[PDB]
Amino acid sequence: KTVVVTTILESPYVMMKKNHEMLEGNERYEGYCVDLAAEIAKHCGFKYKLTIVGDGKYGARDADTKIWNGMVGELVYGKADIAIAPLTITLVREEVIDFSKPFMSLGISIMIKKGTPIESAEDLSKQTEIAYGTLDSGSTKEFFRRSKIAVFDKMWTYMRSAEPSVFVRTTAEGVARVRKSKGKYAYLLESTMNEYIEQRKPCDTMKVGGNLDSKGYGIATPKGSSLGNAVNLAVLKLNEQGLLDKLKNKWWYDKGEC
Template sequence: YQGYMVDLLDLLADSVGFSYRLVPVYDGQYGLLKGDGGWNGMVGELLREEADIAAAPMFVTKRRKRVVAFSQSYREVSASIVMQTGSATALKVTSLRSLLRVDPKVTFGTPKNGAIARSLRKSNDSAVKAMFARMSANPELSFPADHEEGLKRVRRDPMYAYVLQDAIAEYWIRREPCDLMIVDEIEVSEYFGLAARKGSRLVPKLNKGLAKLKDTDVLDKLYFKWWWQGDQCHDTLGKRTLTIRSGSRQLQRYRSLGQRVSVTSDCIVAVIFAMFCVALNY
């Protein structure tokens, strides 16, 4: 395995002293509450003591915090609006507000039950409210099953604007065929954290290691390594992306992403959410 999260786990292991092994999460899910009261995904494996740490781009939510313990955040998450680079509409706009004004035919989308949709639904921003109202009026097109389907719709339809986590968007706009662009960002006040069982002695260790990595800008350097150094689209997208995202704001984006981990005596079994293991290559 290789990727941002593997590097992060290696750094934490060296910093606070543990060993680990990586195991893919069985069902490929982060963790949702099921109808029978149980949990699937990484959260379920933590609760069943099949894993010791869930290390993934997993949102810290109130519902998850009731059953597992989270470390301090290792990434603050924003939402990015992605459109085709060849979209005449996208080239005319520099913000969500201008996108709403320029063309009422633009369809917006985001996964229906995800944390981004939840944040958009709760937003008090008038532009975000207007965007989510369009989504709710056209649910069949606006709520794809996952990011793969959402990005396929963007590539098929120049009038489709897809809203997803900034780190995923920033990765894909820098990968061939270089046909995607970010037109704006939305603050959503969501965070990624590492998870462990309630009462786990690992959480204070993880917090100590993460604090040290933040203070020394190591997380920013990791983000640069896995997102920017592999940029395949400098000539076609670089200038446009830099213009939209702007200098100081861009530098703040250098923090990020993930896997799942479990501990057996002194060995931590890290269960990886594979999509993010090899630099988000699904």
């Protein structure tokens, strides 16, 4: 049967083509994950249909209702057969879905408006003039919520109680907030996204400091899936053949605007 792929609209991973209204099916999209999906499918030998996750979330369990949302939920409840997106491999998720070895390595990072007097997480934690937040509902937020490290716990204490909310619905919302903040808002996001935005006009943001942690994105499938084994071997083969590195250059720097 045709494999149902769930993904999310997050540049430069998945994006609508300028003339998508004129195209059909998979041809409507373009991006790092669109290219990767095509390759994984060829190497595993299956036909697929790309679908954008209904609720636009990555995946979190609701304490109380115990229901999983986002791409993770689509896999858990059988709405999708595989997820190809910048989905962070985490312990809680690994407990309900399967992940291939990572196709990209990254870490949480700090995005500032150029000129902002901030160079580290410690800098953010020791002051209050500059507000900071993260994407809401993702692994970055959870990182801070669960951290037992002094600096990060101190950061979470501030963020969870800040008003108005310092959290954002989407990356684009986070970046727009930094750009219009006049330097009074710093955004905490995954390094890969930070590096991408730094190469986009108006070229007014920059990544500062080292990453706060280290982790990776993996291709996910429902537990016990027939595709799990093959997809994992495909990711390793594609990394060993240099495809992954080629794709990142293609979508990050080959198209740089700064």
